[PDB]
Specification:
CATH architecture of the largest domain: 3-Layer(aba) Sandwich
Radius of gyration: 33 Å
Number of strands: 22
Structural class: alpha+beta
Number of helices: 24
CATH topology of the largest domain: Beta-lactamase
Largest sheet: 5 strands, mixed
CATH class of the largest domain: Alpha Beta
Assembly: monomeric
Name: Penicillin-binding protein 2
Helix content: 25-40%
Number of domains: 3
PDB class: transferase
Distance between the termini: 77 Å
Strand content: 5-15%
Entry title: Structural Insight Into the Transglycosylation Step Of Bacterial Cell Wall Biosynthesis : Donor Ligand Complex
Keywords: lysozyme fold, transferase
Shape: elongated
Length: about 625
């Protein structure tokens, strides 16, 4: 009982402008009957079943003469195309004949004519009349002449034999007989028939070559591929669906409106695709941008040349986070729970003892007393651990967990030192972190990255989606971390040289390393990294880029060896943020509850004794 022509999903960007239409580039466009011009409808009827609206299930008068040796009717012609085998010999015709009478009692003449004008074949993969017209002539039905209509009307009899590109002589003669039938059946006057037949069919024929016409191009506007695969995910996580089958809803005529912004999105996949900041074809990217204020998803890249069912979405897959999470497990909680200044002096060390484990910095050598501001923007390991041990001691054994749980960063088991530093269960997607950071960007208010504004269904219902929003940290903590992390772009900062000019931004970079075992096993040099991140944010936008490799090779081929290779994600970040940020000047909103100025901010009303005026180098 499925005559329905599938009608594919349309996506719109933030402007409500149509952006991608999930039709797999197919040469098919659904057309309602009323939107088909009378002239067109005629040319078909005249050519195939002139007496269609009287009728019923074959004229009988056309089976009076046909047995006399045939021919058939829209209704039944359609029934055949509700797949009745490829064997015929009065067998197909037997079921065809009954199904016709049944279908006529369930569906109106118009609904049958419509399914006709949508399903039938026109050669070179073209199904349906609306497609035929844009294909051969690049014309909408409304403005096309009788020659064109005649031909198109004629084509579905023996499409391949009548396809103009291949058999123009044959096409001409078939268009000619269609015109004759339209005349013979009084669908057009003597004047316009004699004025129609003297028209060049090649009139506005779009010129082409063979390999373009067997190029069913199923990867168009391929920039949207990833923003699309995110829509697909979020579509189904909502009451009104889920009970349902994705594969179906995407062909049930729905209309998705997103927070995508086209230009951010093009820019982003263009830069992922055209980057030179890749060691080898095995290097991967997952980047996500989103609106700091709302958590709405502006653009997104699952990887270089990302296709949808085929490729993994690196922007929505979990990756080991490296030093990315120190603002959430160490220094942020401290500000919220014991109201540290940005100067809280911590002692760096040679190594440190946390449980039966020995931990050291990246460079190895110690730096003595340092400010948390420096410790964060240069990403020292010990001060982080120390700070987390302080928090845990003077605020709660599970106090870190609850700061991180409020920003979407959930841990199944215990949060040990490994995971303070990006190890083990500290794995999260760039999308996950982008949210985490926009909280710092936007006064401390977390927003599970959302992508769908609403969807409008063909049957007339329209569902507004929502996203799990909730205040995650007090304003001062969000502000200080924000101003603190602008220091990442300053001299000595872990991302220096990649700041943008008129724009106020902060970032925490990331550098995940391998297991102790792995270094020897694959002869990886000491300074090789498995995962690199930059997580940056302005008051407008929050971007989180991850890069990493499919699989580890010998001597670092598929690692990031040195600053020059560990730096790659910053190139992608600066290139995009640079293009897409405005230089209006908006900064991070400052509360009354903070006091002082970088590097010395402290919680107003609760000052800290342990500050230092001690610089970097």
């Amino acid at each position: 009982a499925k005559l329905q022509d599938p009608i594919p999903a349309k996506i719109y960007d933030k402007n409500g402008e149509l952006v991608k239409t999930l039709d797999n580039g197919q040469r098919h466009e659904h057309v309602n009957l009323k939107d088909v011009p009378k002239s067109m409808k005629d040319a078909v009827l005249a050519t195939e079943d002139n007496r269609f609206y009287e009728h019923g299930a074959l004229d009988y008068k056309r089976l009076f003469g046909a047995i006399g040796k045939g021919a058939s009717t829209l209704t039944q012609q359609v029934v055949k195309d509700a797949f009745l085998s490829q064997h015929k010999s009065i067998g197909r015709k037997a079921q065809e004949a009954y199904l016709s009478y049944r279908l006529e009692q369930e569906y109106s003449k118009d609904d049958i004519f419509q399914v006709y004008l949508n399903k039938i074949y026109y050669s070179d993969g073209v199904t349906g009349i609306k497609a035929a017209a844009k294909y051969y002539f690049n014309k909408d039905l409304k403005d096309l002449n009788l020659a064109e209509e005649a031909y198109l009307a004629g084509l579905p009899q023996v499409p391949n034999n009548y396809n103009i590109y291949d058999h123009p002589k044959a096409a001409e003669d078939r268009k000619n007989t269609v015109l004759y039938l339209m005349h013979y059946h009084k669908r057009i006057t003597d004047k316009q028939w004699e004025d129609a037949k003297k028209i060049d069919l090649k009139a506005n024929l779009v010129n082409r070559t063979p390999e373009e016409r067997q190029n069913i191009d199923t990867n168009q506007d391929s920039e949207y591929n990833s923003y699309v695969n995110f829509v697909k995910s979020e579509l189904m996580n909502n009451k009104a669906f889920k009970d349902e089958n994705l594969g179906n809803v995407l062909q049930s005529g729905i209309k998705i409106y997103t927070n995508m912004d086209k230009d951010v999105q093009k820019t982003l996949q263009n830069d992922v695709d055209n980057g030179s900041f890749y060691k080898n074809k095995d290097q991967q990217v997952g980047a996500t941008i989103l609106d700091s204020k709302t958590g709405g998803l502006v653009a997104i890249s699952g990887g270089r040349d990302f296709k949808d069912v085929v490729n993994r979405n690196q922007a929505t897959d979990p990756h080991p986070t490296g030093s990315s999470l120190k603002p959430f497990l160490a220094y942020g909680p401290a500000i919220e729970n014991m109201k540290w200044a940005t100067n809280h002096a911590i002692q760096d060390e040679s190594s440190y003892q946390v449980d039966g484990s020995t931990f050291r910095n990246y460079d190895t050598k110690s730096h003595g007393t340092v400010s948390i501001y420096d410790a964060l923007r240069q990403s020292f390991n010990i001060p982080a651990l120390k700070a987390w041990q302080s928090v845990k001691q003077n605020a709660g054994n599970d106090a870190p967990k609850k700061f991180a749980a409020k920003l979407g960063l959930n841990y199944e088991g215990d949060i040990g030192p490994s995971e303070v530093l990006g190890g083990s269960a500290s794995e999260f997607s760039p999308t996950q972190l982008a949210s985490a950071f926009a909280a710092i960007a936007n006064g401390g208010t977390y927003n599970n990255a959302h992508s769908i504004q609403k969807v409008v269904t063909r049957d007339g219902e329209t569902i507004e989606y929502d996203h799990t929003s909730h205040k995650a940290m007090s304003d001062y903590t969000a502000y200080m971390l924000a101003e603190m992390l602008k220091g990442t772009f300053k001299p000595y900062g872990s991302a220096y040289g990649h700041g943008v000019s008129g724009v106020n931004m902060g970032a925490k970079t990331g550098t995940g390393t391998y297991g102790a075992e792995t270094y020897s096993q694959y002869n990886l040099p000491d300074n090789a990294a498995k995962d690199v991140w930059i997580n940056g944010f302005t008051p407008q936008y929050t971007m989180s880029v991850w890069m990493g490799f499919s699989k580890v090779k010998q001597y670092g081929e598929n690692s990031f060896v040195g600053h020059s290779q560990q730096e790659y994600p910053q190139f992608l970040y600066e290139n995009v943020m640079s293009k897409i940020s405005s230089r209006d000047g908006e900064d991070f909103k400052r509360p009354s509850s903070v006091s002082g100025s970088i590097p010395s901010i402290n919680v107003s009303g609760s000052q800290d004794n342990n500050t230092t005026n001690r610089s970097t180098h």
